[PDB]
């Protein structure tokens, strides 16, 4: 289990989002779903010039899995996934930029709901989660587990759990006053509102 320090800016944006009273929190789901859509595009694009890239899964889709027992909402995709390098880098590199850019955009006006415009929407998850765990498997690399609680650092390890062939799995450990996002009707209501244009199937796994 490796531990890394978030690039300063990133850590800030995180604790900002994590400790800021916002009202349009529901937009976090749109941000995560967006990423998965993009992750799906990539994996697909690579297939157009190489079918083998799909020997790890020919199905391109997104899955929403609420779990009242663990108080966790999980967004799962079968996209490109991330290599340990990309996992560590992507959530410790690009952000130093986007993250700062977006924070500057906040003081300059813009509201939290625009975060996605700065290629760092992912972090909006901390609006409704106290801890976020990321599981990913890239065609080349192995299955890793990224995790952080906006403490300034994050940890990466090899995921022992359930194998997934290919794709990314974002596990949101919801905050106490945010369990409303484990309600089928609510999730469904949100997806219809901000993600009615995703080109990939989105399945909701009720309990
Ligand atoms: N679903 C998904 N697929 C891929 N490839 N990457 C992401 C992803 C991108 C990010 C880009 C910038 C900052 C954080 C990110 C966190 C994740 Br978890 N999410």
User: Residue 84 CB: number of other CB atoms within 10 A?
Assistant: 19
CB 161 within 8 A of CB 135: yes
What the block records as the tokens of 54 is 């799909």
135 CB less than 6 Å from ligand 1? no
For residue 198 the two structure tokens come to: 């995703």
Cβ atoms within 10 Å of 153's Cβ, excluding its own: 13
Sign for the pseudo-dihedral over CA of 95, 101, 106, 109: negative
Does any ligand 1 atom lie closer than 6 A to the CB of residue 132?
Answer: no
Q: How far is Cα 135 from Cα 155, in angstroms, rounded to an integer?
A: 12
Q: To what resolution in angstroms was this structure determined?
A: 3.1
Other C-beta atoms closer than 10 Å to the C-beta of 163 total: 9
Measured CA to CA, the distance from residue 120 to residue 13 in angstroms comes to 10
Technique of determination: X-ray
Pairing outcome for strands 167-174 and 129-137:
antiparallel
Whose C-alpha lies nearest to ligand 1, atom 16?
122
Ligand 1 neighbourhood includes 171 CB (under 6 angstroms): no
Helices within the chain (DSSP H only): 8-18, 27-48, 84-90, 96-107, 184-194
Does residue 77 have a known ligand-binding role?
yes
Ligand 1 center–CA 122 separation, angstroms: 6
Structure tokens at 204: 């909701």
| Domains of the chain, start order | 1-207 (3.30.565.10)
Residue nearest to atom 3 of ligand 1 (CA): 39
The Cα–Cα gap between 83 and 139 comes to 8
Would you say how long the chain is, in residues? 207
CA of residue 111 to ligand 1 center, whole Å: 21
């Amino acid at each position: 289990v490796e531990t890394f320090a978030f690039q300063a800016e990133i850590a800030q944006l995180m604790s900002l989002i994590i400790n800021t009273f916002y009202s349009n929190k529901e937009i976090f789901l749109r941000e995560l779903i967006s990423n998965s859509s993009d992750a799906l595009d990539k994996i697909r694009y690579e297939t157009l010039t190489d079918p083998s890239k799909l020997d790890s899964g020919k199905e391109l889709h997104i899955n929403l899995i609420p779990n009242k027992q663990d108080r966790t909402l999980t967004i799962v995709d079968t996209g490109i996934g991330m290599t340990k390098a990309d996992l560590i880098n992507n959530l410790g590199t690009i952000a130093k930029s986007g993250t700062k850019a977006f924070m500057e955009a906040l003081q300059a006006g813009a509201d939290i709901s625009m975060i996605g415009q700065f290629g760092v929407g992912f972090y909006s998850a901390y609006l409704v989660a106290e801890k976020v765990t990321v599981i990913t498997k890239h065609n080349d690399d192995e299955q890793y587990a990224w995790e952080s609680s906006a403490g300034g650092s994050f940890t990466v390890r090899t995921d022992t759990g359930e194998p997934m062939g290919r794709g990314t799995k974002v596990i949101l450990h919801l905050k106490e006053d945010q369990t409303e996002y484990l309600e089928e009707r609510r999730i469904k209501e949100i997806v219809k509102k901000h993600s009615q244009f995703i080109g990939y199937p989105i399945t909701l796994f009720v309990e």
